[PDB]
C-alpha cells in the first residue's frame, strides 16, 4: 500500500494499556500465583504469551475471570514478566534470573527465555 | 532502574492485537457508523482515541456493547482510523484526507489531525 506510519504509535498504545492496568480499568482476569493475585487484560496476556494465547482461545477458558498458575511458579518471576508484557522492560537481575527464565518457559515467551539463556551462559 | 528492553515488543503486541481483531477474538464492542459496524477491543480504542478514552471510563458507557457514532462520521474515514489504531499505518489519500481529518478530530487523535493539516497545507 501507500500508507504513512507513526513511529511511536505502538509504544504509545502500550504505555496507555499499562496506565489502564495500573488504574484497574477494564481488566477482565485475575492471575493467581500461589498467595498472590495479578489483575490484567486477557488480550495483552494473549499478545505476549503462548500459554495465555492457548488458554484464552479455548472455548471454555476464554470465559473464566480467574486463572490459577502451576504452584511451582514464582510470584516475583510472574510480576517481572507481567511488567515486561506491559512495558517492553525486563528487570533481569542475578537474584531473579532463574525464576524469570523458568516463568518465561512456562508462559512460552521465547524472546525472554533467549536473553535469560544468554545472560546465564555469560556468567558460567 | 537497571532493566533491559526488547525493541520490537510494542510492535509485536500491536500485531497480535490486530490478529485477534481480524479473527473477532475477545472483541467486546461494536462501533456503529451509520449503516456500517466495526468490531473492536475497548482497551485498544481507549489507548488510541481521546473520545473512546472518555466513553469507556464513564461508569455507565463502560458497560455498553454497542456505541453509535455521530451521523456526520464517514464509515470509510472511521475504517482507515480503526486500521491505524491497530497497525500504526494510515492510508491517507487525496480522496479520503478531508474525511480522515474530520473523523480524527471527532475521535481526538491529535497526531493524525496534525499530519492531515500538514498534507492539506502542502497541496494549497
Amino acid at each position: 500500500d501507500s500508507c504513512i506510519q507513526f513511529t511511536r504509535h505502538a509504544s504509545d498504545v502500550l504505555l496507555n494499556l499499562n496506565r489502564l492496568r495500573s488504574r484497574d480499568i477494564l481488566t477482565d482476569v485475575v492471575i493467581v500465583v500461589s498467595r498472590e493475585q495479578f489483575r490484567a487484560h486477557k488480550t495483552v496476556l494473549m499478545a505476549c504469551s503462548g500459554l495465555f494465547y492457548s488458554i484464552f482461545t479455548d472455548q471454555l477458558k476464554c470465559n473464566l475471570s480467574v486463572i490459577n498458575l502451576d504452584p511451582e511458579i514464582n510470584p516475583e518471576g510472574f510480576c517481572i514478566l507481567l511488567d515486561f508484557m506491559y512495558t517492553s522492560r525486563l528487570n533481569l537481575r542475578e537474584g531473579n534470573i532463574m525464576a524469570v527464565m523458568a516463568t518465561a518457559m512456562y508462559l512460552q515467551m521465547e524472546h525472554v527465555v533467549d536473553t535469560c539463556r544468554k545472560f546465564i551462559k555469560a556468567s558460567e | 532502574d537497571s532493566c533491559i528492553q526488547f525493541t520490537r515488543h510494542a510492535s509485536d503486541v500491536l500485531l497480535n492485537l490486530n490478529r485477534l481483531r481480524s479473527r473477532d477474538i475477545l472483541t467486546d464492542v461494536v462501533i456503529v457508523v451509520s449503516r456500517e459496524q466495526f468490531r473492536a477491543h475497548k482497551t485498544v480504542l481507549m489507548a488510541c482515541s481521546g473520545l473512546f478514552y472518555s466513553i469507556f471510563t464513564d461508569q455507565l458507557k463502560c458497560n455498553l456493547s454497542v456505541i453509535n457514532l455521530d451521523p456526520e462520521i464517514n464509515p470509510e474515514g472511521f475504517c482507515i482510523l480503526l486500521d491505524f489504531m491497530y497497525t500504526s499505518r494510515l492510508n491517507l489519500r487525496e480522496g479520503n484526507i478531508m474525511a480522515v481529518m474530520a473523523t480524527a478530530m471527532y475521535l481526538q487523535m491529535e497526531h493524525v489531525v496534525d499530519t492531515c493539516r500538514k498534507f492539506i497545507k502542502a497541496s494549497e
Binding site: 504513512i4 506510519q5 | 497526531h111
Partner: peptide, 4 residues
C-alpha cells in the same frame, strides 16, 4: 511520521 515516516514512509514504512
Amino acid at each position: 511520521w515516516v514512509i514504512p
